Tab-separated table of N, CA and C in Angstrom:
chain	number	residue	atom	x	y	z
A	1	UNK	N	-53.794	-31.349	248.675
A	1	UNK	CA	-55.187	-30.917	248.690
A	1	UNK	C	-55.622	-30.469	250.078
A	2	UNK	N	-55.141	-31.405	250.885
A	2	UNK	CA	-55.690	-30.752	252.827
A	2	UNK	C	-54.678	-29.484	253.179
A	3	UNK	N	-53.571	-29.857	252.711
A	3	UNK	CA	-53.065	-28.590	253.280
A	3	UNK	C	-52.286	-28.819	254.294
A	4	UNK	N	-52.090	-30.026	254.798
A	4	UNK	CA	-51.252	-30.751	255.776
A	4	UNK	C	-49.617	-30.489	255.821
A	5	UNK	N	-49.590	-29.868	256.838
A	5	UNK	CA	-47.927	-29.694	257.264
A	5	UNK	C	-46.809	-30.955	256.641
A	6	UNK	N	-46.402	-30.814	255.680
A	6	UNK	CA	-45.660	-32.353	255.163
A	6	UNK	C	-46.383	-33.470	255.670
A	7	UNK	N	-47.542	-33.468	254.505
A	7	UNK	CA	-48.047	-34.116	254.818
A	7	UNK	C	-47.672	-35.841	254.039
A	8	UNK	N	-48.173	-36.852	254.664
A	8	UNK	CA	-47.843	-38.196	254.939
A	8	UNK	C	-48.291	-38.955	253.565
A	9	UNK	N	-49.396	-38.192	252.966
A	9	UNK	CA	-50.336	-39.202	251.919
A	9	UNK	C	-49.821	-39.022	250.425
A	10	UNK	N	-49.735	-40.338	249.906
A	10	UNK	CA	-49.570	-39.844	248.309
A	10	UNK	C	-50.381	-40.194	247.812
A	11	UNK	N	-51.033	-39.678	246.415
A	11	UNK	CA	-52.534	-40.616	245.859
A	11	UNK	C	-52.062	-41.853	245.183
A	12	UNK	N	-50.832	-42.030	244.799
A	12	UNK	CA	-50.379	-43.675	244.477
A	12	UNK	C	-48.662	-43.381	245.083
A	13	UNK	N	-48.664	-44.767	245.284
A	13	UNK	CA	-46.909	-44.856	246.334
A	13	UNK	C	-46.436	-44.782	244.828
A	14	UNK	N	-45.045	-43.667	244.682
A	14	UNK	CA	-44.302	-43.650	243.634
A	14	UNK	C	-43.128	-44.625	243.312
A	15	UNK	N	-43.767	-45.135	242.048
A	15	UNK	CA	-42.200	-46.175	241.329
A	15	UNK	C	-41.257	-45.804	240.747
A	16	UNK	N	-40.914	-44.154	240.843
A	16	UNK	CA	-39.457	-43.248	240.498
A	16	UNK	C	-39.637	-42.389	241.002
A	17	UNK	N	-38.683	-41.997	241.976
A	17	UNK	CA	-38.572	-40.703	242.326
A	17	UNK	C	-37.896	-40.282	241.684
A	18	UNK	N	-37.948	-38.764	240.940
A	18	UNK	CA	-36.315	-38.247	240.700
A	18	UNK	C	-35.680	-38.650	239.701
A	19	UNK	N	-36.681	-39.624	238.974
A	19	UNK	CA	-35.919	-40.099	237.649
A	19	UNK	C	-35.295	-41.901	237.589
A	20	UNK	N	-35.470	-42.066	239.293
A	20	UNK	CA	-34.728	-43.248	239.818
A	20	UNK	C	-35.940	-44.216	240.563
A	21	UNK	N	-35.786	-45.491	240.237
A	21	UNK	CA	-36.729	-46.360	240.593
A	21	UNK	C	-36.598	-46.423	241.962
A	22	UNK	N	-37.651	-46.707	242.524
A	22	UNK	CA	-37.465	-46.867	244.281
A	22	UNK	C	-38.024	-48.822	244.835
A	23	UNK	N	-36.817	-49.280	245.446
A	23	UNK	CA	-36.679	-50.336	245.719
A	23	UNK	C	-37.824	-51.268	246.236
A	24	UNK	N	-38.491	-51.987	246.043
A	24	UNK	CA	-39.606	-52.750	246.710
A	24	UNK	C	-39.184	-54.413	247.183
A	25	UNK	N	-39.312	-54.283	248.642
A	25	UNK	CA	-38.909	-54.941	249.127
A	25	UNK	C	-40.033	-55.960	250.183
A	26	UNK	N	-39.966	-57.423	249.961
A	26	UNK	CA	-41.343	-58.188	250.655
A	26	UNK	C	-40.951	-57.966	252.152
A	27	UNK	N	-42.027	-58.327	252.925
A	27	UNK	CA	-41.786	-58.193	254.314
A	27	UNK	C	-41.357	-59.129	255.167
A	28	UNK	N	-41.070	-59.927	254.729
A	28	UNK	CA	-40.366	-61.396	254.749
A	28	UNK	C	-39.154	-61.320	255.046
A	29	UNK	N	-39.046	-60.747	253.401
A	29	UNK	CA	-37.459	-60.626	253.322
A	29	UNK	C	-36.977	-59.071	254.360
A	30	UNK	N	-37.619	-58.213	254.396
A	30	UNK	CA	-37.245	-56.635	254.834
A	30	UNK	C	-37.063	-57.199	256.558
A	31	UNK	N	-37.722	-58.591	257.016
A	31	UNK	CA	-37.457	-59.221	258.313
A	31	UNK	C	-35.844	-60.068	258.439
A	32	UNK	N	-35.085	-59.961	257.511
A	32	UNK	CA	-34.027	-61.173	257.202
A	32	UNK	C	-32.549	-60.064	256.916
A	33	UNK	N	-32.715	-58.769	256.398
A	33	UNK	CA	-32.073	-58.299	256.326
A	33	UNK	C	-31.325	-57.696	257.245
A	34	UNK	N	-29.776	-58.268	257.133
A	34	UNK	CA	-28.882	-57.600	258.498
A	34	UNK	C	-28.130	-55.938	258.386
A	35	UNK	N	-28.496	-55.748	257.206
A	35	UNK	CA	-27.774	-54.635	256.642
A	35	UNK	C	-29.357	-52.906	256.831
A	36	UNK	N	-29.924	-53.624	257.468
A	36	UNK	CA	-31.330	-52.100	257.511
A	36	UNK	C	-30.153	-50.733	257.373
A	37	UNK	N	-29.524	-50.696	257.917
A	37	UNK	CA	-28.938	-49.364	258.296
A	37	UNK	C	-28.311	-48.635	257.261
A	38	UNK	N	-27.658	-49.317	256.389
A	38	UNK	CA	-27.386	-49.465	255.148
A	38	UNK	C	-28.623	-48.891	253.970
A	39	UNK	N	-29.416	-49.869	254.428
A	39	UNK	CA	-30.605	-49.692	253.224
A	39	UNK	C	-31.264	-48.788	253.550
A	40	UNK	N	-32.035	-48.228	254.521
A	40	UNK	CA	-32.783	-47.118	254.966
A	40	UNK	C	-32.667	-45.935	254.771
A	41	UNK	N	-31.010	-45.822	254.415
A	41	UNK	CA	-30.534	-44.627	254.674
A	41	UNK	C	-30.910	-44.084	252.838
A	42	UNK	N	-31.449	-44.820	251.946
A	42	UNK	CA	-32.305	-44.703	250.802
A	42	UNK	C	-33.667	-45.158	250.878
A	43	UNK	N	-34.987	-44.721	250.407
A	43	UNK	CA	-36.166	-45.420	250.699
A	43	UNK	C	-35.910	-46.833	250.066
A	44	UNK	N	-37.140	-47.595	250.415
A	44	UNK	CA	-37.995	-48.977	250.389
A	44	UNK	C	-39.255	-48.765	250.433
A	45	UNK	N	-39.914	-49.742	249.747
A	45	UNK	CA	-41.089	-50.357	249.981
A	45	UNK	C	-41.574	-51.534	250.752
A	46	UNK	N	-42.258	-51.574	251.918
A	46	UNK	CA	-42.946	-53.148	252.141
A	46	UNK	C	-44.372	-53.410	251.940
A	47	UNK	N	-44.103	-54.372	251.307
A	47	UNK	CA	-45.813	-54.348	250.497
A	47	UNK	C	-46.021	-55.996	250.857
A	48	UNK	N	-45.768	-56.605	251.544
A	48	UNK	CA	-46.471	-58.384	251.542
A	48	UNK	C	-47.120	-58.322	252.782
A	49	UNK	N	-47.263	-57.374	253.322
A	49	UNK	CA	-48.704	-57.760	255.124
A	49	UNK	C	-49.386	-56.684	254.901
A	50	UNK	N	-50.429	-56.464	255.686
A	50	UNK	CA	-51.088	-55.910	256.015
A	50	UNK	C	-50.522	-54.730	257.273
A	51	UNK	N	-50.660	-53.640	257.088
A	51	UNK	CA	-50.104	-52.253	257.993
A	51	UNK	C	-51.015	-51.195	258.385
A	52	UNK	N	-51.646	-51.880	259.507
A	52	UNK	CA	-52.228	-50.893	260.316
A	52	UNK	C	-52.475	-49.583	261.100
A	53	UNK	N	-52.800	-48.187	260.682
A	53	UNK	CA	-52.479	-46.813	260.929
A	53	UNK	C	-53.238	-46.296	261.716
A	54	UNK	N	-53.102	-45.448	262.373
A	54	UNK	CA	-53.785	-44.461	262.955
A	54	UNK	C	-53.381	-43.209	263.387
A	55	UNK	N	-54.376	-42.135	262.468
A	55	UNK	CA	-53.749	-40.775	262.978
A	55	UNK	C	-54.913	-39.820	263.281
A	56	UNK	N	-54.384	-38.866	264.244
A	56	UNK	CA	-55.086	-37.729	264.676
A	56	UNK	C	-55.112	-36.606	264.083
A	57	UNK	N	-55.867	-35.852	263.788
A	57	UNK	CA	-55.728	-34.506	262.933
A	57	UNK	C	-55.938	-33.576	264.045
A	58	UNK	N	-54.932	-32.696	264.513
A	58	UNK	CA	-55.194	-31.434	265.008
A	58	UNK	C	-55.677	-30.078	264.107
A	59	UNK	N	-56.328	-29.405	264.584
A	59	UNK	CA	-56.523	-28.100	263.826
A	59	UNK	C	-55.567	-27.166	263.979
A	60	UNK	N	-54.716	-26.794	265.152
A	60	UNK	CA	-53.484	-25.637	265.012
A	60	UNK	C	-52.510	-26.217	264.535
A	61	UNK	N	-51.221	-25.404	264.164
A	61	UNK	CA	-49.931	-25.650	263.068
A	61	UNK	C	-49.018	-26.367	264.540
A	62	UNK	N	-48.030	-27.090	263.701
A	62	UNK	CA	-47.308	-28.107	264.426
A	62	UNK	C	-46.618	-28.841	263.417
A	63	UNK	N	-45.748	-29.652	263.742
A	63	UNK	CA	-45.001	-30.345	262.838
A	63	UNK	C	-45.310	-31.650	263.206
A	64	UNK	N	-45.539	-32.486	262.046
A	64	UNK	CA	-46.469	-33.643	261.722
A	64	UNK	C	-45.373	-34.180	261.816
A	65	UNK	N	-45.073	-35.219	262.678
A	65	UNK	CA	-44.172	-36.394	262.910
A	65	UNK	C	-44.954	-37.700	263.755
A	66	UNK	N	-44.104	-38.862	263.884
A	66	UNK	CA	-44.713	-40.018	264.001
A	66	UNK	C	-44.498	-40.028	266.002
A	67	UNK	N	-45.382	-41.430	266.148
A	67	UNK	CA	-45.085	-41.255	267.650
A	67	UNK	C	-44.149	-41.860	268.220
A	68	UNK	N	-43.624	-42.957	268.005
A	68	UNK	CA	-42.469	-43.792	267.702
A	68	UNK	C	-41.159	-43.844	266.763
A	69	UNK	N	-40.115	-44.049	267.117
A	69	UNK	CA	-39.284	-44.266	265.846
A	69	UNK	C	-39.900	-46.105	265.304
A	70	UNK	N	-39.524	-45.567	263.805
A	70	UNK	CA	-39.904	-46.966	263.105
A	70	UNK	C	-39.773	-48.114	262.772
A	71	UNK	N	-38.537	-48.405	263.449
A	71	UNK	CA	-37.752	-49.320	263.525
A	71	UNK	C	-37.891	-50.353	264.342
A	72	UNK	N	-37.787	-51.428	264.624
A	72	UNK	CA	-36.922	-52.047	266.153
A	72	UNK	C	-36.828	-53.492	265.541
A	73	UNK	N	-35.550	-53.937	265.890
A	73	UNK	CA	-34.673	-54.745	265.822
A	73	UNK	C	-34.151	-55.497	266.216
A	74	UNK	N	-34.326	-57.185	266.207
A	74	UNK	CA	-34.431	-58.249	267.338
A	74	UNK	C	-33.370	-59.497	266.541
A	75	UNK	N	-33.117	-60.167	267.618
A	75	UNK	CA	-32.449	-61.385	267.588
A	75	UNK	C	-32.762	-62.252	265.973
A	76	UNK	N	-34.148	-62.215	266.242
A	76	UNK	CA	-34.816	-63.045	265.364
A	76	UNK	C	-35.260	-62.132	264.245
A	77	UNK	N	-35.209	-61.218	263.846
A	77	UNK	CA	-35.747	-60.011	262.793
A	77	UNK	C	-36.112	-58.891	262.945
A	78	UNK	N	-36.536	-58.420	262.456
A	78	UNK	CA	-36.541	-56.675	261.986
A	78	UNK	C	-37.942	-56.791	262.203
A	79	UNK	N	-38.559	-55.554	262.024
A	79	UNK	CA	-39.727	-55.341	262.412
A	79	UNK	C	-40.285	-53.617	262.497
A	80	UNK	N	-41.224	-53.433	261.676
A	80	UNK	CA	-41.737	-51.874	261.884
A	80	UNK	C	-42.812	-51.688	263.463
A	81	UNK	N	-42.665	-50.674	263.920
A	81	UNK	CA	-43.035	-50.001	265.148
A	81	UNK	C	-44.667	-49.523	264.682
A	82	UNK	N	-45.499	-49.864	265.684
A	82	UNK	CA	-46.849	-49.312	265.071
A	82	UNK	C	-47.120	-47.402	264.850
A	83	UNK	N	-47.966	-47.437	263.714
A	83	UNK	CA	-47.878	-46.456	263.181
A	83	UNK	C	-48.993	-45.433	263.652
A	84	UNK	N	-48.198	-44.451	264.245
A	84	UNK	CA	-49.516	-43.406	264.759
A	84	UNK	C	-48.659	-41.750	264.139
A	85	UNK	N	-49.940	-41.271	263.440
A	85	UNK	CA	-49.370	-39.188	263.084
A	85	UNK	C	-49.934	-38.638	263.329
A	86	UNK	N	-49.546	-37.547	263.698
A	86	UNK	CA	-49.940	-36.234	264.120
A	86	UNK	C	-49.744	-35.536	262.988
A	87	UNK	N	-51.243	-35.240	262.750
A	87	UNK	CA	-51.427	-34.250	261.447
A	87	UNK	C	-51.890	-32.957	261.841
A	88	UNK	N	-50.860	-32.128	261.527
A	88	UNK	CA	-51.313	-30.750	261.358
A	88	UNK	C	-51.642	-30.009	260.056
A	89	UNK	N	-52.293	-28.748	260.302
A	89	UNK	CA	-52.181	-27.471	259.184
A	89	UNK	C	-51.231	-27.170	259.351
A	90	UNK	N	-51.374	-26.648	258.031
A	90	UNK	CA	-50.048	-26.034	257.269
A	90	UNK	C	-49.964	-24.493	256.926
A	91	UNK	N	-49.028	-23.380	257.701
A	91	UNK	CA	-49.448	-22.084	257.488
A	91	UNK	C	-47.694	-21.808	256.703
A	92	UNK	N	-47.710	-21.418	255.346
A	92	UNK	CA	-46.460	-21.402	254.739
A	92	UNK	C	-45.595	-20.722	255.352
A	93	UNK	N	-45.514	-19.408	255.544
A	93	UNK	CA	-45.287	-18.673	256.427
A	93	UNK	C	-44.110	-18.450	258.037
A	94	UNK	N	-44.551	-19.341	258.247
A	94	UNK	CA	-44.271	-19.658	259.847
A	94	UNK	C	-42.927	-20.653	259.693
A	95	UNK	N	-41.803	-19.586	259.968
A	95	UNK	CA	-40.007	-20.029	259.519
A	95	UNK	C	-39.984	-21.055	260.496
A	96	UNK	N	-40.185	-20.589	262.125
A	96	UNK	CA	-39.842	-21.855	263.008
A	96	UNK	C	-40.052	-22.642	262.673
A	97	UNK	N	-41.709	-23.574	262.240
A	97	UNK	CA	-42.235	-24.228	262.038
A	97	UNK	C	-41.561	-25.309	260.785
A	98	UNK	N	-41.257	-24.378	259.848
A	98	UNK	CA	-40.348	-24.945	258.658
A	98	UNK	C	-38.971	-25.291	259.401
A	99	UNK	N	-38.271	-24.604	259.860
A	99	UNK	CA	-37.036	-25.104	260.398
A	99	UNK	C	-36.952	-26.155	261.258
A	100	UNK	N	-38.046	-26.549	261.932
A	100	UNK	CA	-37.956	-27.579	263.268
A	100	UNK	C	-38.357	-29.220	262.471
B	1	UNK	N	-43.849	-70.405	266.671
B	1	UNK	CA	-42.891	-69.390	265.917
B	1	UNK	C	-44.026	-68.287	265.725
B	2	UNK	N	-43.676	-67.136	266.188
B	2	UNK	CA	-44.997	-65.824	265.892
B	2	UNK	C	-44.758	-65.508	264.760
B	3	UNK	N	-43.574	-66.391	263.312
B	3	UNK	CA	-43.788	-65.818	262.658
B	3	UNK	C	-45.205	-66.232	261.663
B	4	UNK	N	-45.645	-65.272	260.398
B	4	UNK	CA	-46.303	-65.967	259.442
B	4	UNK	C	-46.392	-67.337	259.094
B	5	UNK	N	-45.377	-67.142	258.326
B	5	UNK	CA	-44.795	-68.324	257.560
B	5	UNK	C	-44.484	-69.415	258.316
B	6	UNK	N	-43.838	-69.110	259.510
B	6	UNK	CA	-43.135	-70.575	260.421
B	6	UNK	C	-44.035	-71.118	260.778
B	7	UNK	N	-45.102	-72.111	260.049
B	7	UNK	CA	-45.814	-73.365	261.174
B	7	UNK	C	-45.389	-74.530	261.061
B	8	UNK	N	-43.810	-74.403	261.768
B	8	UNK	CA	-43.404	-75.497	262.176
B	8	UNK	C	-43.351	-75.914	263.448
B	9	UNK	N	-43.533	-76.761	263.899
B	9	UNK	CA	-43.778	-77.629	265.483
B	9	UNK	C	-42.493	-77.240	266.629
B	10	UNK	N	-42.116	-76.093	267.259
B	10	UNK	CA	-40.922	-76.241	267.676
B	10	UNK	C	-40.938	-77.034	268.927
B	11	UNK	N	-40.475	-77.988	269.031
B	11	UNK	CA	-39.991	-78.882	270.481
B	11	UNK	C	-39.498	-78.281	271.808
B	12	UNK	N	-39.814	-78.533	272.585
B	12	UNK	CA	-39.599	-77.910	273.983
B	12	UNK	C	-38.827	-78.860	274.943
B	13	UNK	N	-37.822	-80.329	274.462
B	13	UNK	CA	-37.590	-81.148	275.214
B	13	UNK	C	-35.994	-81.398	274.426
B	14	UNK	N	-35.037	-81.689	275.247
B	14	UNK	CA	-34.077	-82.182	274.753
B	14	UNK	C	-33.218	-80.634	275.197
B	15	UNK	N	-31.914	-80.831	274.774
B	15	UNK	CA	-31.261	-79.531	275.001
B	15	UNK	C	-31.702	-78.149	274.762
B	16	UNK	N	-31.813	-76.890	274.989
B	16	UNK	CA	-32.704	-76.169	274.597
B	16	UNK	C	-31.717	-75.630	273.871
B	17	UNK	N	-32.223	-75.195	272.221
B	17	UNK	CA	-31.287	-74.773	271.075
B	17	UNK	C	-31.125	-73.292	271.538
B	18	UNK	N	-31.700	-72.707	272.250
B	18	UNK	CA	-30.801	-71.248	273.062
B	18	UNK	C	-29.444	-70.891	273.524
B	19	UNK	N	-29.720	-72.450	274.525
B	19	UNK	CA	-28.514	-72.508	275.505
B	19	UNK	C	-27.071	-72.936	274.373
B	20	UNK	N	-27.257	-73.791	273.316
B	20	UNK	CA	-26.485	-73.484	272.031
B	20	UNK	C	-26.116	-72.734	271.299
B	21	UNK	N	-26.801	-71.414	271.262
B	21	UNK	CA	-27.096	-70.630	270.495
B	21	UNK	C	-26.217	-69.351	271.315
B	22	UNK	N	-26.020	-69.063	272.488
B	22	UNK	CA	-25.760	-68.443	273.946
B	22	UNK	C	-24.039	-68.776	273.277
B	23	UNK	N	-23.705	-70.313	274.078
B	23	UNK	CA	-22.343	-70.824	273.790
B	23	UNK	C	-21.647	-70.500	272.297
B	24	UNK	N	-22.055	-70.583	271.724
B	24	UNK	CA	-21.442	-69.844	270.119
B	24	UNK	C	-21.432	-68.634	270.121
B	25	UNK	N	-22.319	-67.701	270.499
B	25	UNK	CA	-22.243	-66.348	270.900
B	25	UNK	C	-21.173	-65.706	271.507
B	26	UNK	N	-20.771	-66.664	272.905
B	26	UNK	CA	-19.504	-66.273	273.702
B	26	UNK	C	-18.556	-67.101	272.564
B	27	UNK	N	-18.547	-68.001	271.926
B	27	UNK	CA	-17.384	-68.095	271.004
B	27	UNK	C	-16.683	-67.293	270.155
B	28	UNK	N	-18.263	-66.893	269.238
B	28	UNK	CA	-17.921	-65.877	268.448
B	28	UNK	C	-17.240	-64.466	269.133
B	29	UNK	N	-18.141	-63.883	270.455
B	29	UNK	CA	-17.336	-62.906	271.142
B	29	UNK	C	-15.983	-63.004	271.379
B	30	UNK	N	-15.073	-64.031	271.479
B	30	UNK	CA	-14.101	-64.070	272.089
B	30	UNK	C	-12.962	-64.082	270.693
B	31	UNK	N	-13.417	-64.807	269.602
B	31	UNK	CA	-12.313	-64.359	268.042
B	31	UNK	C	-13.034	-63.027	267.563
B	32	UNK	N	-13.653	-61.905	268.183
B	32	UNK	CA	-13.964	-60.977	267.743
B	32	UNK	C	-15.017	-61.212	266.290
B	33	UNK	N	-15.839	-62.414	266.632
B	33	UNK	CA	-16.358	-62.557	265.101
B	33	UNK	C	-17.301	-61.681	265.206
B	34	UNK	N	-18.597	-61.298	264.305
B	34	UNK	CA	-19.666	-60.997	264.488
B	34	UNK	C	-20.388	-62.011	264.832
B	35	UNK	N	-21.829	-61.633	266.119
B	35	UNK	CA	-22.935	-62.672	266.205
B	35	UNK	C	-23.356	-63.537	265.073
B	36	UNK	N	-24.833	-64.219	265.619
B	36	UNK	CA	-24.512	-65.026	264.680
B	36	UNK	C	-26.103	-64.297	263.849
B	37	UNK	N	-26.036	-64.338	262.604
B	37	UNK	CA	-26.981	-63.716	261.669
B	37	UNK	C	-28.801	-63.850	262.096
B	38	UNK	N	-29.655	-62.702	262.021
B	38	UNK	CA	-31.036	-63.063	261.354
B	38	UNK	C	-31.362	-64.584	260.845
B	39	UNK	N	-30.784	-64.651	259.762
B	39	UNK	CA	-30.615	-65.703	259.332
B	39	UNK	C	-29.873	-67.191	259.717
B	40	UNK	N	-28.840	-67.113	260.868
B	40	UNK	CA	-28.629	-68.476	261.202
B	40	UNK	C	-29.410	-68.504	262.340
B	41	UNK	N	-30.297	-67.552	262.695
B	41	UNK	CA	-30.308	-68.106	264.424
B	41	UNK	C	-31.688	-68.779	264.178
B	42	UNK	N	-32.722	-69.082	263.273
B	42	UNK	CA	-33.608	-69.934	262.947
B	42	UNK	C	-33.446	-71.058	262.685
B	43	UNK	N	-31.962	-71.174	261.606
B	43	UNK	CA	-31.658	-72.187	261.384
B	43	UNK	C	-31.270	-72.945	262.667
B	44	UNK	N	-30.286	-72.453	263.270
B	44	UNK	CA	-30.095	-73.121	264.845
B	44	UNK	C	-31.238	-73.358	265.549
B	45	UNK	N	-32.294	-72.206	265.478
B	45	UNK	CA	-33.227	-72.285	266.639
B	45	UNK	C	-34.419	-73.432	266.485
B	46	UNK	N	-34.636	-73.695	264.807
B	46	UNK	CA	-35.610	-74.625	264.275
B	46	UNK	C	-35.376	-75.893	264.580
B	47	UNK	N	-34.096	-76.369	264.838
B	47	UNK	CA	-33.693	-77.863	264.579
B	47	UNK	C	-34.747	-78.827	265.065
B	48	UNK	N	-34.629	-78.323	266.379
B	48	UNK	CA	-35.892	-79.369	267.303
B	48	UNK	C	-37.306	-78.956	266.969
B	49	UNK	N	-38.093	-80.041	266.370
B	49	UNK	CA	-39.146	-80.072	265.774
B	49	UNK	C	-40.022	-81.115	266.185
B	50	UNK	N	-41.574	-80.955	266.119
B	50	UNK	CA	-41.865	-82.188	266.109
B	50	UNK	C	-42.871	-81.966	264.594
C-alpha cells in the first residue's frame, strides 16, 4: 500500500509461506539454541518478549535495509541486535536500485 | 542473572564457577572437543546459589 522499497511490514506475520509452514520458535528457547546458523539459513518466528522498533522514513529511493546485523552471539545465549530501518520509496524502474 | 526467567540468587563467594568453567575450556581445547554448550555453561555457572 506505501509503496516502500521491499518493504518490512506484513498485515499478519504468515503461517505458510509457499505452501510450507514457517517455524515458530519461543525466545527462550531461540536463546539456547547452538545450531542458529543452521536454522536461520530458513525463516523463524520469535514471539515470547516484547521487540522494540524504530524506523525512519526517507522520501528519496534507496534500499531499505537494517542498521545492524541481527544477530549477536554470546557465551551465555543468543540474542537479536536492536532494530532500526531505513524506509524508502519505491520507483520500479530504477535497475541499480533493484540489483543492489 | 539478566536473564528473564533466572531469579535465582547467584553467590559471589567460594570458588568462582568461571575460573571452572575457563579450566574445562582449556581441557576441552586440548582433545579437540567442542566448548562447552549454551546450555551447560548455566548449568556450571548456576551451582553457587544462595
Amino acid at each position: 500500500r506505501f509503496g516502500f522499497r521491499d518493504s518490512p511490514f506484513c498485515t499478519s506475520l504468515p503461517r505458510t509461506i509457499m505452501g510450507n509452514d514457517v517455524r515458530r520458535i519461543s525466545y527462550n528457547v531461540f536463546s539456547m539454541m547452538e545450531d542458529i546458523d543452521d536454522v536461520i539459513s530458513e525463516g523463524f518466528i520469535l514471539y515470547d518478549a516484547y521487540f522494540n522498533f524504530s524506523y525512519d522514513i526517507m522520501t528519496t529511493d534507496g534500499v531499505t535495509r537494517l542498521k545492524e546485523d541481527i544477530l549477536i552471539v554470546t557465551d551465555t545465549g543468543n540474542d537479536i541486535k536492536p532494530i532500526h530501518f531505513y524506509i524508502y520509496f519505491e520507483n520500479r524502474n530504477d535497475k541499480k536500485l533493484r540489483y543492489e | 542473572d539478566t536473564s528473564f526467567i533466572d531469579t535465582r540468587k547467584y553467590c559471589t563467594d567460594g570458588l568462582s564457577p568461571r575460573e571452572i568453567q575457563k579450566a574445562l575450556n582449556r581441557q576441552r581445547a586440548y582433545y579437540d572437543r567442542p566448548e562447552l554448550t549454551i546450555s551447560e555453561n548455566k548449568t556450571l555457572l548456576s551451582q553457587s546459589i544462595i
